[PDB]
Amino acid sequence: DYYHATKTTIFNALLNTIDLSQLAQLDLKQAGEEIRDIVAELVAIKNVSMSVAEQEHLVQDIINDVLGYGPLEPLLARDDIADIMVNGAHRVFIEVGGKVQLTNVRFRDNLQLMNICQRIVSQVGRRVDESSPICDARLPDGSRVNVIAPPLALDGPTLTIRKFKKDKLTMKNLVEFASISPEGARVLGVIGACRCNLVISGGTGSGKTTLLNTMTAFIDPTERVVTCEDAAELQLQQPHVVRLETRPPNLEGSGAVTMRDLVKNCLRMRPERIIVGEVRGPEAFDLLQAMNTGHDGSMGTLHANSPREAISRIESMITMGGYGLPSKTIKEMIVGSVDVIIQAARLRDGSRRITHITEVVGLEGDVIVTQDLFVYEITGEDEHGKVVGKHRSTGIARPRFWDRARYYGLERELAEALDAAEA
Amino acid sequence: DYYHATKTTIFNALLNTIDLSQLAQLDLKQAGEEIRDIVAELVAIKNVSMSVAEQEHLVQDIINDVLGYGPLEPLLARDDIADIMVNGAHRVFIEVGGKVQLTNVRFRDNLQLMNICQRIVSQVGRRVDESSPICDARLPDGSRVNVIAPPLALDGPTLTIRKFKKDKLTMKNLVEFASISPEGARVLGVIGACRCNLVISGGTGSGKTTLLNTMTAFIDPTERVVTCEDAAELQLQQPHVVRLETRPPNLEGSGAVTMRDLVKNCLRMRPERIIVGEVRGPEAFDLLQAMNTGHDGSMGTLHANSPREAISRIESMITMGGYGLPSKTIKEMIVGSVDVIIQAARLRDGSRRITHITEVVGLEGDVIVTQDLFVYEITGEDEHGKVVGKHRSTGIARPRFWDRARYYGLERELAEALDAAEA
Amino acid sequence: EAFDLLQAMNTGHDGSMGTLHANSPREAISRIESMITMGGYGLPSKTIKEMIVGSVDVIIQAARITHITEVVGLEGDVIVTQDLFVYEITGEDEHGKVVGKHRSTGIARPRFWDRARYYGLERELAEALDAAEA
Numbered sequence: 001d002y003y004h005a006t007k008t009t010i011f012n013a014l015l016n017t018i019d020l021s022q023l024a025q026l027d028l029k030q031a032g033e034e035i036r037d038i039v040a041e042l043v044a045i046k047n048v049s050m051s052v053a054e055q056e057h058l059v060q061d062i063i064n065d066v067l068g069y070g071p072l073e074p075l076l077a078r079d080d081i082a083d084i085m086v087n088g089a090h091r092v093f094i095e096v097g098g099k100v101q102l103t104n105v106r107f108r109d110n111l112q113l114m115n116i117c118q119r120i121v122s123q124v125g126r127r128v129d130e131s132s133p134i135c136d137a138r139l140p141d142g143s144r145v146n147v148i149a150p151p152l153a154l155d156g157p158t159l160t161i162r163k164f165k166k167d168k169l170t171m172k173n174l175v176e177f178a179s180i181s182p183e184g185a186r187v188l189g190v191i192g193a194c195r196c197n198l199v200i201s202g203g204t205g206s207g208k209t210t211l212l213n214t215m216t217a218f219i220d221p222t223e224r225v226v227t228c229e230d231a232a233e234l235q236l237q238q239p240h241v242v243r244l245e246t247r248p249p250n251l252e253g254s255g256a257v258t259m260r261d262l263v264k265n266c267l268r269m270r271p272e273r274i275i276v277g278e279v280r281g282p283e284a285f286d287l288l289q290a291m292n293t294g295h296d297g298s299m300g301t302l303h304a305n306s307p308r309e310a311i312s313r314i315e316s317m318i319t320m321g322g323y324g325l326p327s328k329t330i331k332e333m334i335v336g337s338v339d340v341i342i343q344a345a346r347l348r349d350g351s352r353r354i355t356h357i358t359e360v361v362g363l364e365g366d367v368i369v370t371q372d373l374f375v376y377e378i379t380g381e382d383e384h385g386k387v388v389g390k391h392r393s394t395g396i397a398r399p400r401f402w403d404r405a406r407y408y409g410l411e412r413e414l415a416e417a418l419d420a421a422e423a
Numbered sequence: 424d425y426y427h428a429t430k431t432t433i434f435n436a437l438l439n440t441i442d443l444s445q446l447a448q449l450d451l452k453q454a455g456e457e458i459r460d461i462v463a464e465l466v467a468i469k470n471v472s473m474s475v476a477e478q479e480h481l482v483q484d485i486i487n488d489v490l491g492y493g494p495l496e497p498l499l500a501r502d503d504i505a506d507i508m509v510n511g512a513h514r515v516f517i518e519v520g521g522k523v524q525l526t527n528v529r530f531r532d533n534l535q536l537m538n539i540c541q542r543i544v545s546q547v548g549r550r551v552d553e554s555s556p557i558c559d560a561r562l563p564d565g566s567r568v569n570v571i572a573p574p575l576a577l578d579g580p581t582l583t584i585r586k587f588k589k590d591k592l593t594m595k596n597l598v599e600f601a602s603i604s605p606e607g608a609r610v611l612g613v614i615g616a617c618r619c620n621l622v623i624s625g626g627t628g629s630g631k632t633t634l635l636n637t638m639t640a641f642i643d644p645t646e647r648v649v650t651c652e653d654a655a656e657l658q659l660q661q662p663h664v665v666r667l668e669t670r671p672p673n674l675e676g677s678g679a680v681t682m683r684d685l686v687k688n689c690l691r692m693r694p695e696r697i698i699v700g701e702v703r704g705p706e707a708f709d710l711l712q713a714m715n716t717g718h719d720g721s722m723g724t725l726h727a728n729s730p731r732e733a734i735s736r737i738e739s740m741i742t743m744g745g746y747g748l749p750s751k752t753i754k755e756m757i758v759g760s761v762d763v764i765i766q767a768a769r770l771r772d773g774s775r776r777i778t779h780i781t782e783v784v785g786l787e788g789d790v791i792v793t794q795d796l797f798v799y800e801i802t803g804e805d806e807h808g809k810v811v812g813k814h815r816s817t818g819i820a821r822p823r824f825w826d827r828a829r830y831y832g833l834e835r836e837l838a839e840a841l842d843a844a845e846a
Numbered sequence: 847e848a849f850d851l852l853q854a855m856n857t858g859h860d861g862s863m864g865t866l867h868a869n870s871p872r873e874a875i876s877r878i879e880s881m882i883t884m885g886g887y888g889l890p891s892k893t894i895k896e897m898i899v900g901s902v903d904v905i906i907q908a909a910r911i912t913h914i915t916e917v918v919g920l921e922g923d924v925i926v927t928q929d930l931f932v933y934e935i936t937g938e939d940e941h942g943k944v945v946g947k948h949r950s951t952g953i954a955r956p957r958f959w960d961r962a963r964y965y966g967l968e969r970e971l972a973e974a975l976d977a978a979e980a
């Protein structure tokens with residue numbers, strides 16, 4: 001009570017001596033000294049029990065409450081926190097290490113929630129109020145912010161904050177987690193710099209984005225890479241990258257910049273390879289054009305269960321655009337475009353596996369045929385109950401892209417990895 | 424070294440005295456004289472250790488700041504810099520000798536780069552802002568400019584200035600670069616004077632404009648040709664040719680003269696054959712009508728990848744007009760108005776090709792019939808990786824345009840081309 | 847708008863529940879297809895049905911809770927749909943009540959066996975659904 005009552009009583013002196021309406025006059029620079037003196041004046045005039053160190057702590061608390069973000073100032077500094085969800089004034093949760101835990105932190109009222117939300121979302125020109133209910137933005141620090149207003153939220157306005165993860169699983173980690181055999185890792189390392197146009201496929205939450213990020217690390221630093229994402233998840237260690245992001249309609253169908261527009265624009269920036277975040281709409285067609293007109297090295301991630309279904313989904317996405325194409329021409333384009341297809345699924349035990357590393361043999365008649373280089377076969381469950389299985393080659397000595405490895409000087413490594421497959 | 428602080432002080436002094444807010448006064452020559460005098464006075468007063476040459480260079484920097492393109496001023500005016508890329512505001516790259524490389528040049532802040540881009544795109548009366556972040560322009564001097572704004576780009580505004588080298592290629596050069604061989608290309612020379620409709624189709628950077636320039640130099644001087652372009656690109660050497668160019672909306676969003684406004688007028692200038700630079704939207708319709716009603720021998724470069732896709736694109740472009748004709752009627756208009764639909768596309772390696780010399784025959788309802796006088800197939804890759812393919816005369820001694828081209832007596836060379844290379 | 851919900855039910859947000867007004871499971875799926883097509887997205891009906899299969903696992907068809915049914919897959923326009931609980935009518939009572947019974951169809955492994963095993967509830971399924979047959 002005292003640790004809160006002292007502040008509740010002291011804040012009145014600071015508010016009355018210089019009202020918040022005086023903002024921009026004696027700003028942060030002068031405001032720091034103003035608060036440092038006003039807190040001391042209030043402590044001297046009004047008896048206080050907190051110590052001198054406690055006096056400085058309360059001065060800093062006043063600074064945070066007046067200028068800073070107040071309640072959320074400590075949380076935003078902790079690196080072990082990923083999400084900060086509010087949903088109210090006294091009921092605030094956080095996420096540390098996957099799980100979600102409630103916290104003992106309290107606002108003052110709903111009006112303070114609105115104040116903090118507006119003062120934090122204004123940093124990127126957004127404005128949310130009773131007339132504008134919803135707000136969604138990407139702050140400069142590298143975080144996502146979302147806010148919902150009263151008229152819709154019966155319980156009251158809600159706030160949601162995220163973070164940009166900086167510890168992503170490297171290829172060595174995936175090797176440790178036994179999701180891809182070391183021979184598979186060697187073959188993937190060959191493919192990465194081999195400039196093959198891979199297309200990652202897998203079910204929801206099967207490890208697609210992480211696998212794509214791991215693959216991107218094999219790019220030589222002397223190439224322009226332009227990434228078209230919707231959530232800004234990837235991070236590359238190359239010295240030359242042009243990160244792009246779409247924009248949803250901020251009003252009733254105005255200002256939309258669909259991923260198709262970004263992919264189409266990238267064709268003119270002279271990229272060396274286009275990397276897409278998630279191919280959902282008709283943009284697939286444009287991406288295939290990029291995969292065809294001398295940008296060997298592109299990558300993508302769709303949502304399919306098996307590579308055959310990945311091909312079917314690509315055809316469906318192309319047809320969705322309504323270009324009036326004949327199906328056989330689409331199949332020819334896909335056959336000439338996609339060189340590799342990596343399948344990433346998750347099993348009933350919660351683990352993640354790379355079921356297939358497939359290549360496209362071509363088109364025979366009216367059917368698309370494929371060859372395989374690694375297949376994850378299940379055999380049973382161990383005593384505990386975890387899934388049990390292992391990979392294997394299909395006796396294919398020189399892949400359909402061996403000449404590429406010869407061209408780029410990776411013939412020896414690929415030959416050793418594939419010959420070592422017989423182990 | 425220390426020139427940065429001294430230059431900042433000099434710029435501040437000049438702005439305080441000769442402020443940029445006095446625009447419309449102290450014009451170019453007056454601005455230069457005033458800046459020189461002010462910089463000399465400041466060097467006399469402001470403590471600067473720079474020498475006389477250093478003072479002159481500081482004056483030049485002041486001039487660039489006041490009325491220049493910013494630190495890019497020396498970048499654009501060098502000898503053999505093919506491409507100039509700006510990824511953000513600190514990592515400007517340049518391409519030399521067919522390979523990229525970093526440059527120590529760097530800007531002052533993202534805002535200055537944004538202003539510089541918004542000014543460079545001003546030469547063509549176009550605007551880039553937060554409500555329209557993508558800009559693609561052809562500078563009058565001939566270079567190509569692309570700009571993306573912070574709302575989409577994450578690392579700051581992204582800029583790409585790709586200059587174009589000297590004078591285009593003749594048909595002889597196109598035969599030298601294996602683009603097409605005479606035995607299957609003689610139809611190009613035949614149509615160079617056969618005066619039949621033609622529509623070049625291709626993808627970005629596929630060389631459509633150069634193909635048109637090569638295929639229009641055959642037209643004999645006696646004919647009156649009216650060329651319509653978004654910006655000066657073609658350099659025909661015939662004696663009787665009329666050139667035009669559109670005007671985008673002015674400062675107040677008025678005075679726009681779109682391609683339709685020019686083609687509809689050219690319909691009443693007694694032209695013998697129109698040459699449209701690039702077809703984008705409704706103008707297509709008018710051009711087709713021009714080809715249908717007397718003005719036989721037109722040309723127009725659209726944007727597509729496959730001839731069927733090109734025809735569907737034309738259909739959609741006309742549908743944008745809002746007349747209410749069926750697909751079959753518009754396809755018949757194409758058949759009787761479009762004779763040859765060439766295709767130009769880059770292969771998986773990049774080198775230019777001519778994948779089609781196609782002709783339109785007729786209709787069988789809502790489905791078009793399209794003979795393919797020529798096609799282009801790909802065998803695989805070469806020892807060094809570059810693609811290997813073959814054009815082949817599909818074989819038609821008497822094509823659809825046999826009758827349409829019988830007047831000039833050109834069925835002779837038509838039979839020669841389509842029989843001397845039938846196998 | 848169901849589309850968004852159906853997108854939620856597939857794109858990682860497991861455990862979404864919707865409420866519509868349709869008589870039979872075929873009628874429910876037909877209504878879902880019509881609603882999806884109503885949005886102007888123009889998705890071919892085949893892909894809409896595939897999305898419906900992906901997003902729908904359990905149908906509590908009240909019509910009483912007359913039906914509890916689940917999807918099995920697709921083979922074309924046909925939407926393979928089996929049953930878990932069926933309510934049948936046998937006659938009428940002197941007071942006029944509709945006399946019937948509610949049968950656990952009999953199949954032991956519904957489509958959601960894997961989820962139940964993951965969360966540690968297959969034993970409950972055996973204790974309830976397998977014992978219901980006997």
Ligand SMILES: Nc1ncnc2c1ncn2[C@@H]1O[C@H](COP(=O)(O)OP(=O)(O)NP(=O)(O)O)[C@@H](O)[C@H]1O
Nearest residue numbers: 169174177179203204205206207208209210352858
């Ligand atoms: N092989 C793996 N072993 C362990 N954890 C993994 C593995 N692959 C991915 N993860 C975890 O999965 C998360 C990475 O995001 P991911 O699961 O790939 O999202 P996503 O596939 O982009 N989802 P969506 O695009 O919405 O379907 C992290 O928590 C990783 O630790």
Ligand SMILES: Nc1ncnc2c1ncn2[C@@H]1O[C@H](COP(=O)(O)OP(=O)(O)O)[C@@H](O)[C@H]1O
Nearest residue numbers: 587597600602626627628629630631632633775
């Ligand atoms: N056969 C060819 N060989 C090499 N370069 C070519 C060939 N044909 C065209 N080009 C190149 O294409 C460019 C022409 O640009 P183009 O793609 O026609 O502009 P647009 O983007 O408007 O289509 C020229 O710079 C030229 O060097």
Ligand SMILES: [Mg+2]
Nearest residue numbers: 631632656701
């Ligand atoms: Mg052009």
